[PDB]
């Protein structure tokens, strides 16, 4: 319950791999993450939804753990509906 929103930041390796794990999500699944960051990080909700600007060094620790937790749920499966 509180481990997600009151989490500590992940390392540079993990943040970078998180950029890579969202890159793995097919457009359908991907649209969630683009939305997640934009929803949690108001400062980048000005980014065009087609070309969203994510700054992994500014995202909240909970944002990272929402992004990672969500994508890993997808990667750890046969994620080939639109890919």
């Amino acid at each position: 319950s509180e481990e997600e929103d009151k989490c500590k930041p992940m390392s540079y390796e993990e943040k970078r791999q998180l950029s890579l794990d969202i890159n793995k999500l097919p457009g359908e699944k991907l649209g969630r993450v683009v939305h997640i960051i934009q929803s949690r990080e108001p400062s980048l909700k000005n980014s065009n939804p087609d070309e969203i600007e994510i700054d992994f060094e500014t995202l909240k620790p909970s944002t990272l753990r929402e992004l990672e937790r969500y994508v890993t749920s997808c990667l750890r499966k046969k994620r080939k509906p639109q890919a």
């Binding site: 649209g31 683009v34 994510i54």
Partner: peptide, 12 residues
């Protein structure tokens, strides 16, 4: 210095 330009949701 890490930026993720996720390019998607483009209208078709």
């Amino acid at each position: 210095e890490i930026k993720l330009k996720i390019t998607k949701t483009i209208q078709n």
